Design an enzyme around this catalytic site. Sequence first.
Site, PDB file in Angstrom:
ATOM      1  CG  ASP A  10       8.513  -5.800   0.231  1.00 30.80           C
ATOM      2  OD1 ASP A  10       9.102  -4.971   0.348  1.00 30.80           O
ATOM      3  OD2 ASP A  10       7.942  -5.979   1.668  1.00 30.80           O
ATOM      4  N   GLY A  11       5.055  -5.849   2.427  1.00 26.28           N
ATOM      5  CA  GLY A  11       4.204  -5.109   2.793  1.00 26.28           C
ATOM      6  C   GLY A  11       5.403  -3.832   3.960  1.00 26.28           C
ATOM      7  CD  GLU A  48       7.139  -7.469   7.478  1.00 23.34           C
ATOM      8  OE1 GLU A  48       7.921  -8.696   7.860  1.00 23.34           O
ATOM      9  OE2 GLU A  48       7.557  -7.021   7.052  1.00 23.34           O
ATOM     10  CG  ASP A  70      12.203  -7.472   2.281  1.00 26.88           C
ATOM     11  OD1 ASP A  70      10.809  -7.853   2.217  1.00 26.88           O
ATOM     12  OD2 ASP A  70      12.349  -7.091   1.797  1.00 26.88           O
ATOM     13  CG  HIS A 124      21.076  -5.543  -0.224  1.00 27.14           C
ATOM     14  ND1 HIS A 124      20.393  -6.415   1.248  1.00 27.14           N
ATOM     15  CD2 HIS A 124      22.141  -6.340   0.120  1.00 27.14           C
ATOM     16  CE1 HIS A 124      21.630  -7.044   1.465  1.00 27.14           C
ATOM     17  NE2 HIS A 124      22.349  -6.755   0.883  1.00 27.14           N
ATOM     18  CG  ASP A 134      10.380  -1.723  -1.009  1.00 28.80           C
ATOM     19  OD1 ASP A 134       9.650  -1.533  -0.179  1.00 28.80           O
ATOM     20  OD2 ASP A 134      11.384  -1.126  -0.977  1.00 28.80           O
TER      21      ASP A 134
END
Length: 155
Positions: A10-11, A48, A70, A124, A134
């Site tokens: 995640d970024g 990311e 994601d 989500h 995250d």
Amino acid sequence: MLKQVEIFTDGSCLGNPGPGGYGAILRYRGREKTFSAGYTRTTNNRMELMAAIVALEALKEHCEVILSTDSQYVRQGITQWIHNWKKRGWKTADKKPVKNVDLWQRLDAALGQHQIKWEWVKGHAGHPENERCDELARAAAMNPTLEDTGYQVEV
């Protein structure tokens, strides 16, 4: 002991550009390594890509990887752009270097050493590992310590 290497990334970034960070979790060998760093001025997209880069660069042998993220930008990249970018020589239709070519080439070099399976999760509906990424990414953006050399308002 897991038979496939698992990476979750995640970024995050507070502006365009602004301070940003990444979180990556790597389950390699029997360990679970966590990487996270913040950069003073970068973008969400660069972060990311950086997450996937640092996790892969940690692998010292050819492995069978499952990478879960994601990130829409990495997915568009991997699924629609990279293939044609390598044939066009890393140029846009108007003959300029592609955006963030520095990171895409760096990622391409890492991908080339492994057998990768990509898991595109919904933001989500990620695993506990994606959520942790995250959290790490947001935390890093709040206390940045590195310079994102490659960043350009430019090219």
